[PDB]
Amino acid sequence: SGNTGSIINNYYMQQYQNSMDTQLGNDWFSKLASSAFSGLFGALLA
Amino acid sequence: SGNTGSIINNYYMQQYQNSMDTQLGNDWFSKLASSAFSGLFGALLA
Amino acid sequence: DKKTTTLLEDRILTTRNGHTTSTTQSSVGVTYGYATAEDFVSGPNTSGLETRVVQAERFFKTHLFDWVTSDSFGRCHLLELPTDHKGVYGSLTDSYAYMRNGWDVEVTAVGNQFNGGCLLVAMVPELCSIQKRELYQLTLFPHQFINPRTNMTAHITVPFVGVNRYDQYKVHKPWTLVVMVVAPLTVNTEGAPQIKVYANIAPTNVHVAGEFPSKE
Amino acid sequence: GIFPVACSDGYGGLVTTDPKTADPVYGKVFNPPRNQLPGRFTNLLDVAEACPTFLRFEGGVPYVTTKTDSDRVLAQFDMSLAAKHMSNTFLAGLAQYYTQYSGTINLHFMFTGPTDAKARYMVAYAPPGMEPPKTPEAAAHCIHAEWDTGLNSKFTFSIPYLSAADYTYTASDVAETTNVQGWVCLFQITHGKADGDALVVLASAGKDFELRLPVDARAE
Amino acid sequence: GIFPVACSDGYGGLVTTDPKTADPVYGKVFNPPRNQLPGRFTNLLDVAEACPTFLRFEGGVPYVTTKTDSDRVLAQFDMSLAAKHMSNTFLAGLAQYYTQYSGTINLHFMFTGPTDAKARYMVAYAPPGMEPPKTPEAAAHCIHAEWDTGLNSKFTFSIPYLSAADYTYTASDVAETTNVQGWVCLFQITHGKADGDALVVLASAGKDFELRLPVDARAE
Amino acid sequence: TTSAGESADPVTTTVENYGGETQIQRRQHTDVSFIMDRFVKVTPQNQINILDLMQVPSHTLVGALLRASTYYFSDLEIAVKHEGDLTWVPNGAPEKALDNTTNPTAYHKAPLTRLALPYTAPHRVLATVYNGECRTLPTSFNYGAIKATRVTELLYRMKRAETYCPRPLLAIHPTEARHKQKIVAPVK
Amino acid sequence: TTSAGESADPVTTTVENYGGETQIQRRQHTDVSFIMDRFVKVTPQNQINILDLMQVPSHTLVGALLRASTYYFSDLEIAVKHEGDLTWVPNGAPEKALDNTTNPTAYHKAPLTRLALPYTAPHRVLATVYNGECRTLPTSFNYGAIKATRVTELLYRMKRAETYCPRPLLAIHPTEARHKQKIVAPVK
């Protein structure tokens, strides 16, 4: 993920390398693009 | 392959070390050399 | 020749391209250069809009040069391809922006079997000019020789080649047909006095894409 | 003894795009939760496909208006992401940061005249190698589409990627006098009382549009 | 603590032929497809075997012509990849970039006279240690082949690798007055009305020809 | 195809409409996390420098793409050329803390110092624009601050970037029909 | 053996024809990928240098072998001695991009910088000759460009090389019967 390309494990724990995300209690534009109409609206001839 | 001689794995992913080839949808000179006539064209005596 | 009096046997070859045929009784076979088939004709650069035009796949003709006794080793005649074409293939170049095709090439040098000397015929990619020393290695390219005591016809078949999958022929010519004098023509007492060299060429696997507007 | 190593010349300098990470210094930080926030986008081209943005025509407006001449050309412009007509689009804004592209670009045309104004239009793509057509009759021989007005106000057309090479440049070189990728030609076939009415035009990325090779080229 | 290492003196400098790779800086680049392109070659010797190229004789021509003397020597030259006669061949062009070779070199002879010209030729390989033969009779005692003209215009002969050492040098030293690898001797046994006709000569690598030890030796 | 243009529903036609064929696309280079993950230089203040991504110039690749989003999140790496030792303090710290070396302090080591730092703002995400004063962004929108005797070069690098709600991204407005520039090419 | 010489069909006789024995050959040194995989020096321009393999002199091992092919493909490594930091931009980039350091920029580290770079041309392969102007090769035939305050040494190294359609490869034309040179030898 991102512009990273080492095959070997980071020497430092994740807890130190980055901040840790938390959750309470989802790519909108990807869904929007996928939902695009790509057909033809009336009758097609030939 | 090439002039490379390390026995251990590259530290960087292939995706970073080199460009990645793609395919659509083969050594001509090797086949040509292998196909060479190496016999004798007429009758052989002694 | 590997066959059997006059020009003969399994040395009789008939080539057909479209509604045109060419027969020779002194064939020495066909040289396939670099591949025996084309690579992919439908890639991403034409977005599935290319089409084949079979009506252009037929023989057209041109005179190359007259081989005379004064020509010495290294004398060459170069013909860039595609060349001017006044038939269907030529009209395609004015109707579509992109094209690709290979070539089926027949070169003849008709004198008689009492002439001596030798011509080398080769198909060379990306060739505008060549130096004298490089001619000694012209055999690295798809070729065939014409040696009067044996044959009058050379036949080479090559696929489309290039850094691009389709070409713009108005600005780039991928192939050049070269005919070079290897040993000077000899006439002696019974040979033909000179030998006119002609080419009979057919575009193969012709594909076009990108229709142009008319001039109207 | 200890492990011997060869500290290698030519390696180790800082590279601005290197694929490795720095050493950390301040650990155990937990972030406030942000799951399910609305409006996320993870690939800029999803946005480019889904949100068409306006073209720019003479006068600084996003539309062309019906003409009442013998001249039927509504607009003709270079099929280039560096074209003035495309200069205010999100597509051009994105393309300036990559050196090459491939694939489909979609144009959208929306009629805004009143119910009693009717018109028939034609879009054509003219490839490089010959001057672009000046009339609908000459342009008919190109890849093209014609459409008229009615209940549906919008028509969308895909400009195809056609080129000798597999990719084309997003930027335009000072030496190239005529556009290397051809032209987009928009004509008015005819109209019925649509004098002065506007046809709004937008552009979006097509399904196989692709940008590659990031580049930071602006001086300002 | 951390891992201790010995940064070793004598290691780490850039070497122009080193067997390792550089660190990358610009990832995820996918190339246009190039599978099945025609004419690929992966070993230069495949090309050297399959494509014979022309020898060069006095006058700058690739052939020798029938003589009408008592002198039956058509050509005699040093069996050396540095010989003037081999200097325009692909084989010599390749050999200049290696210091040693071993194995077979093939010579091809193609008759180009008219149907009513006939001839009989002889090729012989004369090893170092004695002066090369001046006549077909003296050369008969060497390894040799004789052939005549007819339906087939070409004859091919293998020059054998014979030496004290397992490899020989491709270059020729300024101190070696006589060629260390001997001579190739081409004679005309006799001819029937072949005055002035040309015998074209080419060379190609044999099946066990081998070049080793790359070297870049040209100053220009 | 025709459609009701008044609706915002996206319409994406393809070349198949007139007989063409849609190709495969590889969009790794337009992935947000990948494209933002590279260093960009800012002009530094002599000593105290607040870590604020809005300092990245708007015409740069990173600066323009960051401004094409309304809200964003990321961890950060900085590369700094400085004299003396470099101290960093988190978001919310009194400015005086920059003189106390128990706060993360990197001792000088030629030619520069590179550090990975976590996001430390009190908000779930930060914003590139904020409609409070209707310019100025709240003081809490920052990644802390650094200080050294002299800071001569400062580069920022966004890690694990996330972007929400796209905003305008503008190319150069050309004067002629096409914006033309000198492209790299083999010499004369 | 005799054969029809007019045909291009290869004929490869062996010493067995007269009683000899063909030996085993080991041709690793003439493998294309192996032989092209080594650094070769070019004379650099002071600041901006377009990465173009045709700059390799034609008499060098790499330059001559490259010219013995019509079309080729390879990734690349470069080793550069330079003052200041070195920036590289890909094929197709405006020349001005060379002044922006978000493009891959290697900060100066004695004694030189070595980098692995991917092929970035828009074509499936490049060519050493191109029959367009019938010298000049299209502008798109390059591996990008680099720039530093001063570039004093530049070496190219072809990686994963592929070659298609062989072309003439010439040795020196000697004046005497054999080209003779001083070969390395134990002293006097």
PDB file of C-alpha atoms in Angstrom, chain C residues 49 51 53 91-99 167 170 207-212, chain D residues 127-128:
ATOM      1  CA  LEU C  49     -11.553  -0.347 -34.725  1.00  0.00           C
ATOM      2  CA  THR C  51     -10.333  -4.026 -40.198  1.00  0.00           C
ATOM      3  CA  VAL C  53      -8.879  -5.297 -46.480  1.00  0.00           C
ATOM      4  CA  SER C  91      -5.997   4.292 -52.100  1.00  0.00           C
ATOM      5  CA  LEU C  92      -6.054   2.810 -48.553  1.00  0.00           C
ATOM      6  CA  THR C  93      -3.120   5.057 -47.606  1.00  0.00           C
ATOM      7  CA  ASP C  94      -5.227   8.101 -48.492  1.00  0.00           C
ATOM      8  CA  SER C  95      -8.303   6.783 -46.688  1.00  0.00           C
ATOM      9  CA  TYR C  96      -7.020   5.569 -43.297  1.00  0.00           C
ATOM     10  CA  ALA C  97      -4.549   7.112 -40.872  1.00  0.00           C
ATOM     11  CA  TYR C  98      -2.981   3.854 -39.623  1.00  0.00           C
ATOM     12  CA  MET C  99      -1.990   0.658 -41.442  1.00  0.00           C
ATOM     13  CA  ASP C 167       2.220   2.620 -38.864  1.00  0.00           C
ATOM     14  CA  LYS C 170       3.346   8.810 -45.104  1.00  0.00           C
ATOM     15  CA  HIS C 207      -5.172  -3.939 -41.794  1.00  0.00           C
ATOM     16  CA  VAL C 208      -6.291  -0.309 -41.574  1.00  0.00           C
ATOM     17  CA  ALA C 209      -7.710   1.950 -38.827  1.00  0.00           C
ATOM     18  CA  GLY C 210      -8.758   5.575 -38.431  1.00  0.00           C
ATOM     19  CA  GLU C 211     -10.854   6.653 -41.383  1.00  0.00           C
ATOM     20  CA  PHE C 212      -9.994  10.069 -42.831  1.00  0.00           C
TER      21      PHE C 212
ATOM     22  CA  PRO D 127      -7.333  11.438 -37.117  1.00  0.00           C
ATOM     23  CA  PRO D 128      -3.943  13.057 -37.736  1.00  0.00           C
TER      24      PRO D 128
END
